[PDB]
Structures are given as C-alpha cells and as structure tokens.
Amino acid sequence: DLNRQTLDELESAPQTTRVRADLVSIGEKLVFLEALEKRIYAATNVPYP
C-alpha cells in the first residue's frame, strides 16, 4: 500500500489536563493569543526579546 499506517499513529494518546489560555479565531483556524511579559520577564532583569 502507499498510504501506510504511520509510525506516529500507533502511539498512545497522552493524558491531558486543563490550562487557562486565550484563544482567537482568525480565518479558518484557531490561535493561542498570548502576551509574555507577565508570566515570564516579571521583575527579572532580562530584556524582553
């Protein structure tokens, strides 16, 4: 066959938990929208890249 069973599709579906995070729809696909100067770079002296 050409369309084989792919090696990845034999693996287990891993265990999942719940995370609070912002989700935005643009076009036809969803997006994680996120700002990163409060979770990370809060009061540590490293420049925001």
Binding site: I40, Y41, A42, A43, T44, N45, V46
Partner: protein, 49 residues
C-alpha cells in the same frame, strides 16, 4: 524574592537575587477643642443653684 531565567552565551550568567527592606512608621496626631463658659460652670457644679 526574585525568580530567574536561564540564558545562553555570550550573555552573563545570573544568580538568584534577594531583597530585604524595613520601613519606619511615621507619627501624626490630632487636635480638637471644646470651649465652655464661666457662668455655666457654676450651673454644672451647683454654685448658682
């Protein structure tokens, strides 16, 4: 207490910093008056009864 991040070269390697602070309590007060009258003092005591 400050957290850290982990950098790569050629940046400096940082250490866990700490901060320690004490503040001095300022002091303020109040004022309020009451003034009575002379020939009403005898009325409270009883000299002019």
């Amino acid at each position: 207490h400050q957290p850290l991040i982990a950098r790569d070269g050629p940046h400096p390697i940082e250490q866990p910093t700490h901060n320690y602070m004490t503040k001095i309590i300022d002091r303020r007060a109040l004022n309020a008056a009451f003034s009575l009258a002379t020939e009403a003092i005898a009325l409270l005591t009883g000299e002019a009864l």
